[PDB]
DNA sequence: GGGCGGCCGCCCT
DNA sequence: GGGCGGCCGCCCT
């Protein structure tokens, strides 16, 4: 049970836990209205609120022995933990806490290896998920290896096998920091791989680069129109390596703006010029703030 | 805005079809126009369903043209479109041919038709291609609780108005409703409120539509036909033999019930009459209100519930 | 931060 | 010498 005014750890839609205080409780919207340290406020599902630890029973069996984590010091039966403990040990939510982080989870060290193992087993059933038509969201708001909430159009990767979406912070295969709504990847999660993830960058067209970066600027700054040269092209150049342009990567910095501007002008159904609202014609924005769709998907 | 009173326009009705009409009133707040049609009938039509009319690109109103984004002229309405301005994009293959090209507007106009859109022909082939791309955003749609109506009144491949219970199919995937006139998978004209189908639209299938007829029980046959009679004639009670059974026999082929289809005409009334008397929850005899016993009506004027596949 | 009242100034046959 | 492409920037749907 929870109670108003209680200090808790709440998992956000980026897979990470944040310290907060329960202000309100909704009995079965199944959420708590939580204020965070930056005085930001939001509703959080109970499955994402953190107060045997899985069985509430004291008996240490054999070979179902009670194992105590060596960091948080909480106990787990060998067959109650997810995954099960056979044979220094850390539990799942301590493994995730010390490994998952913005930009991508840790790749090296004992904790990172413990994550790689435990990631292969989901804390939920794939059958109990109810997806929308485009397989972007599910009713349970249950995604990734962690089982937390998530927004597909932000920094998440969809597995091309199980079609589940996975947080940037929870994957360990990223060479560069993820861009918002970047779907130009072939990704296979650790569950489907039964081991380390597979990640391959799909080739980008100039219209893809323009769309993806305009989308990122739009998300970051919460605005629509951007100067094609001084804002958009600047962001593209500053993130050129992060973009993995593929075979377009050798394009001289002087020649990049030509192709980008051409894409902005040609694709009228995708990009709005400032001239349409009596502003600078070099100002461009997305008609609909939606991530670019790679050739394969929808 | 674009419109003024006395202007002759093409107005899209809730069947997905355009009709010739004249604007009598304009409502800025409702974004609609009061339109009189050729049958002198009058109704309010949303601006999104009004077609003004009947070398510059009609979409962006610019006149530049160069490969691989050239200006393509519609071989019917004569209007020009950039390859990347049209929805969907015009493939460069089109320009590399002697064959005609119609725009999305003209493609729909020449193919969509009462009882079901054209199945064969170059135009029919173009419809099945173009309608895989919606002219609207599904995310902008604000649906009601039962997912029957949205406040935008935007449905189907066409983006026009519609009544789900009046000749429309719901896709089992995207849950959007599609006009009878806009689909190319029907074998027979639809009955009102007939949801005994498994339908997958071209948008979800990325190709031809999928359609399978779900089986009807005798209670479903009576319910569906009672519902149709109630909607058409705007009343509740009908004569089981002279009115209901007459409708059922006249629409027996169009009903396509499945395993019960081979039932002899003379035998059908036996099972229909029993269904009316057995399903007390759905069917209401006239005796319950001190009227003739063989009069029957639906307690709730709603379509029958289709079975899970 | 973008919708629109406002008008600069190029350049029109 | 005036019509319109172009967009500044005021100020709050
Ligand atoms: Zn995660
Ligand atoms: Zn236990
Ligand atoms: Zn622990
Ligand atoms: Zn997977
Ligand atoms: Zn339609
Ligand atoms: Zn155009
Ligand atoms: Zn046309
Ligand atoms: Zn569909």
The answer to whether residues B194 and B223 belong to one domain is no
What is the distance between the alpha carbons of residues A182 and A162, in angstroms, rounded to a whole number?
18
Tokens representing residue B255 in the block: 């009903």
How far is the centre of ligand 8, averaged over its atoms, from the C-alpha of B210 (Å)?
A: 10
B1 located within any domain: no
Give me the residues of A, 127-166, that contact B with CB < 8 A. Answer: 133
The answer to whether residues B221 and B300 belong to one domain is yes
A75 located within any domain: yes
What is the separation of C-alpha B258 from the centre of its chain, rounded to a whole number of angstroms? 23
The answer to whether residues B162 and B204 belong to one domain is yes
Among A133, A266, A288, beta carbon nearest to B69: A266
A266 contacts on B by Cβ (under 8 Å): 69, 82, 84
Helix (H, G, I), strand (E, B) or coil at A271: strand
The answer to whether residues B129 and B188 belong to one domain is yes
Task: Confirm if A266 and B84 have CB atoms less than 8 A apart.
Answer: yes
Selection from B268, B273, B271 nearest residue B251 by Cα:
B268
B2 located within any domain: no
What is the distance between the alpha carbons of residues B141 and B147, in angstroms, rounded to a whole number?
10
Tokens representing residue A196 in the block: 């380390």
Residue A218: nearest nucleotide (C-alpha to C1'): C1
Whether the CB of A280 is less than 7 Å away from nucleic strand C comes out as no
Among A133, A266, A288, beta carbon nearest to B84: A266
A25 Cβ neighbours under 8 A, 6+ residues apart:
A2, A3, A4, A32, A33
A269 contacts on B by Cβ (under 8 Å): 59, 84-85, 87
The 8-class DSSP code of residue B219 comes to: H
B138 contacts on A by Cβ (under 8 Å): 133
Backbone angles phi, psi at A60, to 5 degrees: -95, 105
Q: Given A202, A224, A241, which residue is the final one in a domain?
A: A202
B272 located within any domain: yes
For C1, nearest residue by CA–C1' is: A223
Cβ atoms within 10 Å, residue A172: 20
Selection from B280, B212, B285, B211 nearest residue B244 by Cα:
B285
Among A266, A268, A288, beta carbon nearest to B59: A268
Among A133, A268, A298, beta carbon nearest to B85: A268
Q: Given B33, B68, B103, which residue is the final one in a domain?
A: B103
The answer to whether residues A116 and A82 belong to one domain is no
A1 located within any domain: no
How far is the centre of ligand 5, averaged over its atoms, from the C-alpha of B159 (Å)?
A: 7
Q: Which of B57, B64, B65, B84 to mutate to test the interface with A (most CBs of A within 10 A)?
A: B84
The range of the structural domain enclosing residue B272 comes to 215-309
Task: Confirm if B248 and B296 have CB atoms less than 8 A apart.
Answer: no
Residue A277: nearest nucleotide (C-alpha to C1'): C3
Q: Which stretches of chain A are assigned E, i.e. beta strand?
A: 7-11, 17-26, 31-36, 41-45, 49-50, 66-68, 75-77, 156-158, 165-167, 185-188, 198-201, 226-227, 271-273, 283-286
In the numeric block, the tokens 């081991």 are attached to A195
For C5, nearest residue by CA–C1' is: A278
- Inter-chain touch A133–B175, beta carbons under 8 Å: yes
What's the half-sphere exposure (Cβ side, CA atoms, 13 Å) at B279?
A: 20
Q: Is A63 left (phi over 0), alpha (psi -120 to 50) or beta?
A: alpha
Beta bridge partners of B50: B11
The answer to whether residues A234 and A268 belong to one domain is yes
* A271 to chain B: closest CA residue: B85
Tell whether A266 lies on the interface with B, counting CB pairs under 8 A. yes
Tokens representing residue A15 in the block: 């897979």
Decide: residue B61, CB within 10 A, 0-12 exposed, 13-18 middle, 19+ buried: exposed
Decide: residue A227, CB within 10 A, 0-12 exposed, 13-18 middle, 19+ buried: middle
Tell whether A29 lies on the interface with B, counting CB pairs under 8 A. no
What is the distance between the alpha carbons of residues A77 and A184, in angstroms, rounded to a whole number?
42
CA dihedral B130, B135, B138, B144 (to 10 degrees): -110
Whether the CB of A242 is less than 7 Å away from nucleic strand D comes out as no
Tell whether A267 lies on the interface with B, counting CB pairs under 8 A. yes
Backbone angles phi, psi at B200, to 5 degrees: -120, 115
What is the distance between the alpha carbons of residues A46 and A50, in angstroms, rounded to a whole number?
8
Number of structural domains found in chain B: 4
Among B59, B69, B174, beta carbon nearest to A133: B174
Selection from A155, A151, A149 nearest residue A171 by Cα:
A155
Which ligand approaches the C-alpha of residue A133 most closely? 8
How far is the centre of ligand 8, averaged over its atoms, from the C-alpha of B102 (Å)?
A: 25
Give me the residues of A, 40-59, that contact B with CB < 8 A. Answer: none
B278 located within any domain: yes
The answer to whether residues B208 and B219 belong to one domain is no
Work out the minimum CA distance from B232 to partner chain A, whole angstroms.
34
Deposited resolution, Å: 2.2
Tokens representing residue A294 in the block: 């790679």
| Distance in Å, residue A226 CA to nucleotide C2 C1' | 12
A110 located within any domain: yes
Whether the CB of A135 is less than 7 Å away from nucleic strand C comes out as no
Residue B263 sits at the vertex; the CA angle it makes with B259 and B269, to the nearest 5 degrees, is 120
The answer to whether residues A101 and A61 belong to one domain is no
Q: Given A182, A202, A222, which residue is the final one in a domain?
A: A202
The answer to whether residues B152 and B196 belong to one domain is yes
The answer to whether residues B48 and B60 belong to one domain is no
The answer to whether residues B148 and B180 belong to one domain is yes
The answer to whether residues B88 and B113 belong to one domain is no
- Whether the CA torsion A152, A157, A161, A162 is positive or negative: it is negative
Burial A145-161 (b: 16+ CB within 10 A, else e): bbbbbbbbbbbbbbbbe
Whether the CB of A279 is less than 7 Å away from nucleic strand D comes out as yes
Beta bridge partners of A145: none
What is the distance between the alpha carbons of residues A274 and A21, in angstroms, rounded to a whole number?
44
Q: Is A56 left (phi over 0), alpha (psi -120 to 50) or beta?
A: left
Task: Confirm if A76 and A54 have CB atoms less than 8 A apart.
Answer: yes
Task: Confirm if B245 and B267 have CB atoms less than 8 A apart.
Answer: no
Tell whether B204 lies on the interface with A, counting CB pairs under 8 A. yes
């Amino acid at each position: 049970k929870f109670e108003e005014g209680q200090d808790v750890l709440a998992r956000w839609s980026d897979g990470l836990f944040y310290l907060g205080t329960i202000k309100k409780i909704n009995i079965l919207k199944q959420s708590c209205f939580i204020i965070f340290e930056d005085s930001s406020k939001s509703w959080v599902l109970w499955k994402d609120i953190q107060t045997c630890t899985i069985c509430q029973e004291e008996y240490s069996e054999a070979p179902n022995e009670m194992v105590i984590c060596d960091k948080c010091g909480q106990g787990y039966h060998q067959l109650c933990h997810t995954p099960h403990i056979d044979c220094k040990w850390l539990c799942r939510q301590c493994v995730f806490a010390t490994t998952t982080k913005r930009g991508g989870a840790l790749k090296k060290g004992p904790n990172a290896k413990a994550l790689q193992v435990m990631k292969q087993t989901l804390p939920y059933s794939v059958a109990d998920l109810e997806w929308d038509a485009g397989h972007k969201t599910n009713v349970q708001q249950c995604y990734c290896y962690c089982g937390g909430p998530g927004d597909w159009y932000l920094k998440m990767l969809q597995c091309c096998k199980c079609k589940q979406w996975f947080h940037e912070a929870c994957v360990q295969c990223l060479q560069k920091p993820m861009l918002f709504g970047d779907r130009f990847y072939t990704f296979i999660c650790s569950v489907c791989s039964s081991g380390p993830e597979y990640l391959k960058r799909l080739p980008l067209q100039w219209v893809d680069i323009a769309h993806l970066c305009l989308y990122n600027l739009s998300v970051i700054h919460k605005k629509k129109y951007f100067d094609s040269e001084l804002e958009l092209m600047t962001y593209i150049n500053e993130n050129w390596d992060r973009l993995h342009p593929g075979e377009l990567a050798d394009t001289p910095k002087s020649e990049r703006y030509e192709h980008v501007l051409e894409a902005l002008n040609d694709y009228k159904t995708m990009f709005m010029s400032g001239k349409e609202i009596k502003k600078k014609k070099h100002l461009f924005g997305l008609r609909i703030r939606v991530p670019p769709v790679p050739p394969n998907v929808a």
